[PDB]
Write a structure and sequence with these properties.
This is part of a larger assembly, with chains A (123 residues), B (59 residues), C (72 residues) and D (175 residues).
Chain B lengths: L1 H18 L8 H11 L7 E2 L5 E2 L5
Chain C lengths: L2 H20 L1 H30 L19
Helix pairs in contact in C: 1-2
Chain D lengths: L23 H6 L7 H15 L10 H21 L4 H24 L1 H11 L15 H37 L1
Classes of the chains: A alpha+beta (123), B mainly alpha (59), C mainly alpha (72), D mainly alpha (175).
The complex binds magnesium ion (MG) (34 copies).
Chain D binds one RNA strand of 160 nucleotides through α3 and α4.
RNA sequence: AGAGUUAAAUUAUAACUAAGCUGUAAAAAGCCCUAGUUAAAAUAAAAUAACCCACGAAAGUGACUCUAAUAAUCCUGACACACGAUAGCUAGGACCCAAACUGGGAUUAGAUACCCCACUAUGCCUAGCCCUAAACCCAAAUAGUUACAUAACAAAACUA
């Protein structure tokens, strides 16, 4: 997977939820994006109250959209989630599973350093 | 090393061939939307000092 | 220590700045007078070139620009 | 300006078997459509290093390095067209260019014909580093402008003085 | 270098409550269109992580996300070429906070200061300059070696 879309959406009922989800996904496919999977993390009380579009929201729906999109495109996508009155906050992050795990080998111990101060017979 | 690279790229291309069937398309919109609405997946994860993982408790 | 060399400089610099304020406008007069010699000696350097190269007048299309007196 | 097409099927995926029977979704993902800019640079690199060169296999060749450098250079040229305030990159570019000119010098010393080919293909025109790097300033460039004027006036008036005598001695010799 | 984003704080400005609030060794001045609590954008600045030691040629760089991206099959090299912290200049914006300056209050033989109160250029953004620092790690660059060896101190001594 290439890009990840963290969506926090206004807390709602079922219909308008499916509405926001689909229309957003269609914006994505519209910029040329290709969607791998769609993930709902539940609806929770947010870590803090966020102020979006003349509204300070307490609760919210949590969503994850993983997709492939071209470099040029990404900026545009953000604009489209930006003016959207129902999005409590957009973010697009380089997808976590692209990043490599190069093995933590362990702790290679750092011994005490020597030959800093010169040998002097002082006092 | 030409062998090695040929193999790797073959593995990859066939993997994306596999996941090509799993994608969300103009059709899958109504289906997948209402499917994910149904099924919350938890990413929540914890750790213990031994290195053992303990995921969220079974419900 | 070495400060005592440096301290000298400090005083010797400070005492300069003071001077440059009091003597300031006097210094402007002398300076602009000095550009007024500059541009002129430039001129003679060129006139000497016509009058060595034999032409009485300056070559066609020569206004002989003022560089030293340039401002703005 | 050249154009490594949207459908060009990323360089590391180009030579693997059974690609062209595959569905449009995966050909859309492995297209230069979804790629970083580094991949499109790998492509421009491939193409330039085939068209200009002889032995595309040699990296160590002075010539192939000249090419790759020209690629990075061109990349930085667009990048410096977009960002006009970015000094870091401007330095990258301005140095890169002189490394290229250093090694072009190195080739004009060793292999002539190949060097002439590289000049003809990539668009690089090798010019001599001049004698005496100096700072041309107002006064000097001015004095030189005048001097050139005085010169082109003196030889002109000389031509008038010699043609008056050519016309007079000719008109006396004829009748 | 762009483009977007904001966590804690602060403040406009409202609503309750209190008459005091701010400030020092100690006091005055100052504000009471003040303070506390409850609400809240804009600008600015980026706790902790860091007991880390990465990146950049140096200056520098440690809030968040993405795009662009780190010269050289790699010795040295100018007065040439491109950079360069703070402060400063020019024009257009910004202004919560800080603050040269100036004005009050004290301190004092005096106080053009140290201490307090305001408040400005000025720090901030865009374009263009100016090209200076104890720009210092006061240790030139690139190969090397730990053999000879202690002026003194400090970052032990040397070849090419
Ligand atoms: Mg010692
Ligand atoms: Mg003196
Ligand atoms: Mg003089
Ligand atoms: Mg040479
Ligand atoms: Mg002649
Ligand atoms: Mg900017
Ligand atoms: Mg307040
Ligand atoms: Mg106190
Ligand atoms: Mg009072
Ligand atoms: Mg710290
Ligand atoms: Mg550090
Ligand atoms: Mg790149
Ligand atoms: Mg490098
Ligand atoms: Mg080097
Ligand atoms: Mg060098
Ligand atoms: Mg500067
Ligand atoms: Mg400034
Ligand atoms: Mg201004
Ligand atoms: Mg101000
Ligand atoms: Mg304001
Ligand atoms: Mg203030
Ligand atoms: Mg006073
Ligand atoms: Mg006294
Ligand atoms: Mg004292
Ligand atoms: Mg103020
Ligand atoms: Mg600044
Ligand atoms: Mg420094
Ligand atoms: Mg120092
Ligand atoms: Mg330093
Ligand atoms: Mg020095
Ligand atoms: Mg010295
Ligand atoms: Mg050097
Ligand atoms: Mg040795
Ligand atoms: Mg001794």
């Amino acid at each position: 997977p290439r890009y990840e879309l963290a969506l926090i959406l206004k807390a709602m009922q079922r219909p308008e939820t499916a509405a926001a989800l689909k229309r957003t996904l269609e914006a994505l496919m519209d910029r040329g994006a290709v969607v791998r999977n769609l993930e709902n993390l539940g609806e929770r009380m947010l870590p803090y109250k966020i102020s979006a579009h003349n509204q300070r929201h307490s609760r919210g729906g949590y969503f994850l959209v993983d997709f492939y999109a071209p470099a040029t495109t990404v900026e545009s996508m953000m604009e489209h989630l930006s003016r959207d009155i129902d999005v409590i906050r957009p973010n697009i992050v380089k997808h976590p599973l692209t990043q490599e795990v190069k093995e933590c080998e362990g702790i290679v111990p750092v011994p005490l350093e020597e030959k800093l101060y010169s040998t002097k017979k002082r006092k | 090393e030409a062998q090695a690279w040929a193999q790797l790229k073959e593995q990859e291309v066939l993997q994306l061939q596999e996941e090509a069937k799993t994608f969300i398309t103009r059709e899958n919109l109504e289906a997948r939307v209402e499917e994910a609405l149904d099924s919350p997946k938890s990413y929540n994860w914890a750790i213990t000092r031994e290195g053992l993982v303990v995921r969220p408790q079974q419900k | 220590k070495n400060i005592l060399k440096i301290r000298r400089r400090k005083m010797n610099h400070h005492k300069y700045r003071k001077l440059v304020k009091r003597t300031r406008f006097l210094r402007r007069k002398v300076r602009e007078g000095r550009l007024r010699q500059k541009q002129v000696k430039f001129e003679r350097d060129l006139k000497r070139i016509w009058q060595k190269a034999g032409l009485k007048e300056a070559p066609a299309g020569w206004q002989t620009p003022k560089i030293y007196l340039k401002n703005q | 300006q050249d154009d490594p097409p949207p459908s060009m099927l990323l360089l590391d995926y180009q030579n693997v078997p059974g690609i062209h029977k595959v569905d449009d979704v995966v050909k859309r993902l492995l297209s230069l459509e979804m790629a970083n800019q580094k991949e499109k640079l790998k492509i421009k690199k491939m193409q330039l290093m085939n068209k200009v060169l002889e032995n595309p296999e040699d990296t160590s060749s002075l010539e192939a390095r000249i090419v790759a450098l020209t690629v990075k250079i061109r990349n930085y040229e667009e990048h410096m067209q977009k960002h006009r305030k970015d000094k870091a990159h401007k330095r990258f570019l301005l140095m890169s260019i002189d490394q290229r000119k250093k090694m072009l010098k190195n080739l004009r010393e060793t292999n002539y014909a190949v060097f002439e080919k590289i000049c003809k293909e990539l668009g690089i025109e090798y010019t001599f580093p001049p004698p005496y790097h100096r700072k041309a300033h107002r006064r000097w460039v001015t004095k030189k402008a005048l001097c050139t004027q005085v010169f082109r006036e003196v030889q002109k008036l000389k031509k008038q003085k010699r043609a008056l005598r050519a016309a007079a001695v000719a008109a006396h010799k004829q009748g």
